[PDB]
Design a binder for this molecule. Sequence first.
Ligand code: HEM
Ligand SMILES: CCCCCCCCCCCCCC(=O)O
Ligand SMILES: CCCCCCCCCCCCCC(=O)O
Ligand SMILES: CCCCCCCCCCCCCC(=O)O
Ligand SMILES: CCCCCCCCCCCCCC(=O)O
Ligand SMILES: CCCCCCCCCCCCCC(=O)O
Length: 583
Amino acid sequence: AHKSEVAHRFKDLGEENFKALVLIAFAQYLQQCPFEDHVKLVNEVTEFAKTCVADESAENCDKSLHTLFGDKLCTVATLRETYGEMADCCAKQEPERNECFLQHKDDNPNLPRLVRPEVDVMCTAFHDNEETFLKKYLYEIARRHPYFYAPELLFFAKRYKAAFTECCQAADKAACLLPKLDELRDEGKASSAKQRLKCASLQKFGERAFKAWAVARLSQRFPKAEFAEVSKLVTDLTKVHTECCHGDLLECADDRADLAKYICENQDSISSKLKECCEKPLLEKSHCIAEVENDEMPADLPSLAADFVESKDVCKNYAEAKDVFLGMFLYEYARRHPDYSVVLLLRLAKTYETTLEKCCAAADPHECYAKVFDEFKPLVEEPQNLIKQNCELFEQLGEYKFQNALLVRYTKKVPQVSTPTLVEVSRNLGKVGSKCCKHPEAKRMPCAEDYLSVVLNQLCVLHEKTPVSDRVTKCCTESLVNRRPCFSALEVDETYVPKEFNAETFTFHADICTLSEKERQIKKQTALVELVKHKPKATKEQLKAVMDDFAAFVEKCCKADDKETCFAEEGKKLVAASQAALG
Ligand code: HEM
Ligand SMILES: CCCCCCCCCCCCCC(=O)O
Ligand SMILES: CCCCCCCCCCCCCC(=O)O
Ligand SMILES: CCCCCCCCCCCCCC(=O)O
Ligand SMILES: CCCCCCCCCCCCCC(=O)O
Ligand SMILES: CCCCCCCCCCCCCC(=O)O
């Protein structure tokens, strides 16, 4: 509705947010134009918006947002010279014009990777002009990530602003700042990866699969909501997810805004944890509702045995509307289990489905599916035990040593993966342990699921078009519900031919003593991987012995008079003895 949509958007978003969003929008299309050009564009658009705010009847104010945005894009002088055929989109009637612009966004613009400046430099730039400093980076990230949901970039921005504001006036600027920048950076990459994984998953596995996932996730989140409400929400969420995957900012923003609005106007039928965020500005509503903690589930809910196993109408109810019945099963199981990963829940539903498909065709269905819940136990226990053993291992080893244990275990399983990748995945997996094991058992599986989906997705992306193992491909292309267990099922590669010994690979220098904590760990874990690759049959026990000799080697040589030679000569003996021990 509204006479002037731009005026309406300006009034609701507020000038500052409007300007930041217009900047992101333009940067995501004019990925090659300079920052100053974008600033000029934003000011021009904002000044126009203001005329509309002052008067909805002002000239051009009644044009749609897409029309106005596309027109502005087409007034860019160097459009054809810089963007080639994208300039051809201007010859199209708006509707088709927007689609054309959308399809011309470059998800890999081949721009130089952003590098973190020195703390003193960053902080000083921040101080000299926070606005420009922040907007400059907002522009650099946006143009490198067209498709990254614009509003979400605004949330990251405000978090960076806070990080710099607090850390740049602290006693130990770097100690304060860097960890925060590391976190933001990681969350950013993860969010981007997550956004792509979800759309890729929708594409490959279909809408039904997404709806199943949605029923489970929404049910854990809103356990007190009726199934019909959850069902309605899954339909709306599927639409938002599908349209947001199409990529148009406005269409996606309006869909999310619509859903958030519906949710907020129906809190009594959805959850008691939404008050604080249903009071938030339109811009932040959906984002905040998306992070709302699970509502508390209804007290002493009955077992599902009655309706899904004991009832005489099980097969009758199932056959009449299979997906609806399975959806009900999933909703009842999930609302009761916020402690399960969504995929575990999907494996339980699939198991139930398979049994009903088999049993309902039997002469006497009930006799056949009577013990279906028994089939659930082993499925639930697998992740549960895996988390127990890993958190127990982590608690007795520490993050670093924990990563190293994973490093050796995975290298042995897939020795063909590149060393840098084995190190990175192992380290990241070590962190998920450090992060999730800090949660009580009740919240560990969902945590692991969320973080592992990131780490494993990244591994899969790297393996994609850089494959080295059919088994990794299998796990990466299999159903997302069988992804993690598939990786867990990898066995030691016994066909792996030991990698020839490379002297250079096992030669260390005094510089190792001056590297940062991170750089040092990476050098050691890198050498550890190469060690396992060269001696794949070396037992974890034999490896520890060599690791201890090495540990004593670096320590009992980094701090020992003027010696840049106790690495060369003492290293020669270490390598010689190790080759013997592992021979
Ligand atoms: C305006 C606020 C900012 C936002 C919204 C933002 C957002 C992001 C996002 C979403 C990513 C990950 C993208 C990916 O998937 O690769 C990222 C990465 C990164 N950001 Fe920011 N950022 C902001 C400000 C800054 C600032 C002020 C700095 C440095 C002074 C910075 C330095 C970096 C670095 C070094 C990376 C890693 C790049 C890479 O590994 O290729 N960011 N940022
Ligand atoms: C609104 C109700 C939506 C119900 C969705 C059907 C549920 C299907 C459960 C079967 C699980 C399949 C798992 C998978 O897609 O990989
Ligand atoms: C050049 C025109 C720029 C128009 C500004 C784009 C509108 C931003 C919509 C952001 C609202 C997000 C709400 C949500 O996620 O629920
Ligand atoms: C670079 C390739 C690494 C391959 C290792 C498989 C991926 C890790 C399996 C997923 C983690 C499961 C949790 C665990 O460690 O028990
Ligand atoms: C690499 C260290 C991971 C530490 C956390 C334990 C992870 C155990 C796997 C849990 C998987 C949950 C999702 C699923 O149901 O498959
Ligand atoms: C061919 C023999 C090479 C012997 C040197 C092994 C180097 C591997 C370093 C292992 C790192 C262990 C972790 C640590 O001590 O911090």
